[PDB]
Design a protein around this nucleic acid. Sequence first.
DNA 1: CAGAGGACGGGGAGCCGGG
DNA 2: CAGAGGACGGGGAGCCGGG
Lengths: 99, 97
Amino acid sequence: HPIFHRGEFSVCDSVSVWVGDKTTATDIKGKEVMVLGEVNSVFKQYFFETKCRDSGCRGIDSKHWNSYCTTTHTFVKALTMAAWRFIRIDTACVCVLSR
Amino acid sequence: EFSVCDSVSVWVGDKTTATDIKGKEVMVLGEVNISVFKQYFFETKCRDSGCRGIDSKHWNSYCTTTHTFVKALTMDGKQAAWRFIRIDTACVCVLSR
DNA sequence: CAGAGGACGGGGAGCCGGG
DNA sequence: CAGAGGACGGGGAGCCGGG
């Protein structure tokens, strides 16, 4: 999904990228932290990030609704400065409504 | 304000099995070392009709759970291996017609 | 190191989790 | 075990990434 060959598409478009160069982050606490290049046997730290691409979300009933596309976040462990902590990684592009 | 597709988020700390980024089933180890830590994962997914707020007249629609990839310490034979596994991460709306 | 309401959700840092 | 195209997206295991 979306099942393209069947004509499907997201309400909000996203872009996904692998992030190998991360140096600072906001942690789960809401505080800014330094993220290490490598963690221990030894690995580079990589994060899969997915952001809103781009108004309004596609396919919305504008007679009843305001809408916008926004980036939501998950929490992924990372070695940070040394502590093993949850950090905010962008993860989807979802559609939020009102009025 | 609310989502077009309602999600539920939860902490999971009892994951023994998962699908890895290759598409293959793998065993997830209880704990990982540095001082030891349990592996917990943040998982978000759809709860449940179309999505909410959609122009029904013109569009079919459904809510679906999307996934991200998170490293975890996994069993590979008699060795430990640090592999990306698939984790539910959001609920989004897919359109058609 | 010390939870949860209203119906036609709730345990572990101002943390994660609204016709 | 060695990339990318139509236009009013592209590098590192069937892997990640459509009026």
